[PDB]
Write an enzyme that holds these catalytic residues in place. Sequence first.
Site, PDB file in Angstrom:
ATOM      1  CG  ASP A 154      47.542  34.231  36.720  1.00 29.62           C
ATOM      2  OD1 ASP A 154      47.679  32.872  36.906  1.00 29.62           O
ATOM      3  OD2 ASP A 154      46.980  34.740  37.420  1.00 29.62           O
ATOM      4  CE  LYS A 156      44.123  32.013  37.364  1.00 28.13           C
ATOM      5  NZ  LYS A 156      44.337  31.724  38.629  1.00 28.13           N
ATOM      6  CG  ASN A 159      43.554  35.228  35.349  1.00 26.95           C
ATOM      7  OD1 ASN A 159      42.753  35.165  36.359  1.00 26.95           O
ATOM      8  ND2 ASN A 159      44.752  35.527  35.564  1.00 26.95           N
ATOM      9  CG  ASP A 172      42.790  38.986  37.441  1.00 28.24           C
ATOM     10  OD1 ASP A 172      42.452  40.007  38.142  1.00 28.24           O
ATOM     11  OD2 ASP A 172      41.804  38.348  37.369  1.00 28.24           O
ATOM     12  CB  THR A 189      47.125  29.054  37.809  1.00 30.96           C
ATOM     13  OG1 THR A 189      46.872  30.564  38.410  1.00 30.96           O
ATOM     14  CG2 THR A 189      46.258  27.910  38.506  1.00 30.96           C
TER      15      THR A 189
HETATM   16  N1  LIG Z   1      39.326  36.190  40.273  1.00 36.08           N
HETATM   17  C1  LIG Z   1      40.409  36.622  41.177  1.00 36.08           C
HETATM   18  C2  LIG Z   1      40.819  37.967  40.946  1.00 36.08           C
HETATM   19  C3  LIG Z   1      39.533  38.861  40.098  1.00 36.08           C
HETATM   20  O1  LIG Z   1      38.342  38.516  40.686  1.00 36.08           O
HETATM   21  N2  LIG Z   1      39.816  39.694  39.135  1.00 36.08           N
HETATM   22  N3  LIG Z   1      38.714  40.361  38.641  1.00 36.08           N
HETATM   23  C4  LIG Z   1      39.352  41.337  37.996  1.00 36.08           C
HETATM   24  C5  LIG Z   1      38.417  42.157  37.038  1.00 36.08           C
HETATM   25  C6  LIG Z   1      38.667  43.150  36.426  1.00 36.08           C
HETATM   26  C7  LIG Z   1      37.945  43.975  35.445  1.00 36.08           C
HETATM   27  C8  LIG Z   1      36.667  43.812  35.480  1.00 36.08           C
HETATM   28  O2  LIG Z   1      35.789  44.239  34.470  1.00 36.08           O
HETATM   29  C9  LIG Z   1      36.244  42.597  36.141  1.00 36.08           C
HETATM   30 BR1  LIG Z   1      34.339  42.392  36.157  1.00 36.08          BR
HETATM   31  C10 LIG Z   1      37.017  42.024  36.878  1.00 36.08           C
HETATM   32  C11 LIG Z   1      41.436  38.835  42.151  1.00 36.08           C
HETATM   33  C12 LIG Z   1      40.380  38.973  43.101  1.00 36.08           C
HETATM   34  C13 LIG Z   1      41.113  39.799  44.194  1.00 36.08           C
HETATM   35  C14 LIG Z   1      42.553  40.095  44.188  1.00 36.08           C
HETATM   36  C15 LIG Z   1      43.283  39.828  42.985  1.00 36.08           C
HETATM   37 CL1  LIG Z   1      44.858  40.253  42.811  1.00 36.08          CL
HETATM   38  C16 LIG Z   1      42.592  39.055  41.856  1.00 36.08           C
END
Ligand SMILES: NC[C@@H](C(=O)N/N=C/c1ccc(O)c(Br)c1)c1cccc(Cl)c1
EC number: 2.7.11.11
Length: 338
Positions: A154, A156, A159, A172, A189
Amino acid sequence: ESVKEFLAKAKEEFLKKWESPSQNTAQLDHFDRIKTLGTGSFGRVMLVKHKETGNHYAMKILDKQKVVKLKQIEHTLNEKRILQAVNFPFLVKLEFSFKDNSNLYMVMEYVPGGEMFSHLRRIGRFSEPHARFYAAQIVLTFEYLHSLDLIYRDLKPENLLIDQQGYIQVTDFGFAKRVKGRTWTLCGTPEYLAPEIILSKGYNKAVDWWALGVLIYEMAAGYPPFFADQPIQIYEKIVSGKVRFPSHFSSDLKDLLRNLLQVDLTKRFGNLKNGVNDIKNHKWFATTDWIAIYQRKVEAPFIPKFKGPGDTSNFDDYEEEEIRVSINEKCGKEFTEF
Ligand SMILES: NC[C@@H](C(=O)N/N=C/c1ccc(O)c(Br)c1)c1cccc(Cl)c1
């Protein structure tokens, strides 16, 4: 030999954690809810604060019933089992995990600088040195992951978080998988899918190297190489073997991209007998000190602006919805190993 011994130790350490995963290392009421940072079709990511230490974390909360309905059970188990077992400078760390009657929880380090996606769209495009700085970190991260038989699937800009030093933190891992040989799931994606995914083939780690080509193009141009209104139109462009480069791209960048965006997976850089070294030794990376990047000794092109570990100014605003925990256990059997 130095790289060989490094990766041998990395695999030893990964396998020990892979074979005996951590479970149930915190609980929800250890944390205060601060803000919603992201959403998906079956969960949300929250900024939280640990009530005793004061530390901030990003907490990914997945709704078990929605994971079942959307046939994501294996993927969610992959994600947590992999994350608790890996250790690399450019991977976000999983600090705690747990589950309750309704949800699965992964509590990760919080990276206040935000997603590369936002910075790229704000700036427009990155210069080649700036794109190369990020690309080098992805190359090293994929060298690490692939050596553990892990495919990421994934890549992109959304992420890739930018940390306080300006370095990448990949997050992610929802599609990451341990694979010896090939795998078949349609996931990713659209703009970033390799042709062999689109064509329903058994595919391997070469899809990550294709996605790196897409990412490098997007970083340097400001838009991805294959774009259209409908996914089907994107897929037709991907499989065609045709890409147009902006005139401002250097010759070296175009040459690297033709070899990463190679439709024939048996000819694609990263998937040949020389493996990652065809990429690391390419002229576009001639100025890259791979060891200095790994050691985080290179001054970054860009330091995100933020006020402190609780600042959310680099993230977007979402409706703040209740996070309910049912009085009754849902889908217990399906998630026993989590
Ligand atoms: N962009 C969409 C993504 C997301 O927001 N991931 N964020 C991860 C993250 C990790 C560590 C961090 O320190 C920060 Br800041 C962010 C997502 C949203 C909802 C469900 C799923 Cl499965 C995936």
